[PDB]
Design a protein that fits this description.
Chain B: It comes from Mus musculus. 2 copies of one chain form a homodimer. Chain A is mainly beta. Chain A has 1 helix and 7 strands. The first copy, chain A, is globular and about 40 Å long. The relative contact order of chain A is 0.21.
């Protein structure tokens, strides 16, 4: 689905691309120098923020304020890797909505991190 | 040639202590990374309001993601988080499924989802990190 994720000017690291269904929301990003941490592997500074938006992003399609968010990291991503990022509206409820993102390594398949996120509507 | 599903069915029934709260709990299926279980919510499972209780829904995430852990190549808990989308009422039959997301030299991670057996509908999604102590 064609448009693109054009909230991206002024905390904003869109360097990220796409593929949009209902309650689901693929994107992709190539880890670069700016994205990374003390080591080479993008830290979850970025990852978090990435789960924040693209969740919220994937949601302004069906937008709220954050509430709770949690992230578990399980694989590094190196500078130079290209990664995909899947978002899935889990629940859309009256006052609250729930969403769950998966960040994998494209080349590898391998799961990098996985984080859930709740926001408040109204 | 492997009777992992059968076999877990006994390890479980032996070890269900606090875990003895999980007696009405069936195993439907035991893969080497996914695990399925069901459980009709009773009333000794229930909350203050008659839905399934918060704690037990975590107890079901701890234990059953740990069961899961025993299939492949146990631990201790590191962290857990759990999110609640929908009430499981009395009489309900719930499927609980577990996913080992990750392997690891000293840590293992798994995700678990509670579904309505009949709606299909989500109840709670949980994520559980253990240390391979």
């Amino acid at each position: 689905k064609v448009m693109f994720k054009v909230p991206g000017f002024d905390v904003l690291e869109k360097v990220t691309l796409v593929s949009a269904a209902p309650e689901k929301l693929i994107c992709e990003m190539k880890v670069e120098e700016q994205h990374t941490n003390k080591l080479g592997t993008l830290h979850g500074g970025l990852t978090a923020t990435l789960v924040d938006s693209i969740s919220t992003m994937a949601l302004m399609c069906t937008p709220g304020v954050s509430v709770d968010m949690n992230i578990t990291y399980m694989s590094p991503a190196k500078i130079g890797e290209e990664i995909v990022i899947t978002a899935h509206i889990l629940k859309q409820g009256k006052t609250l909505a729930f969403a769950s993102v998966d960040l994998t390594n494209k080349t590898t398949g391998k799961l990098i991190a996985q984080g859930r996120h709740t926001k408040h509507l109204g």
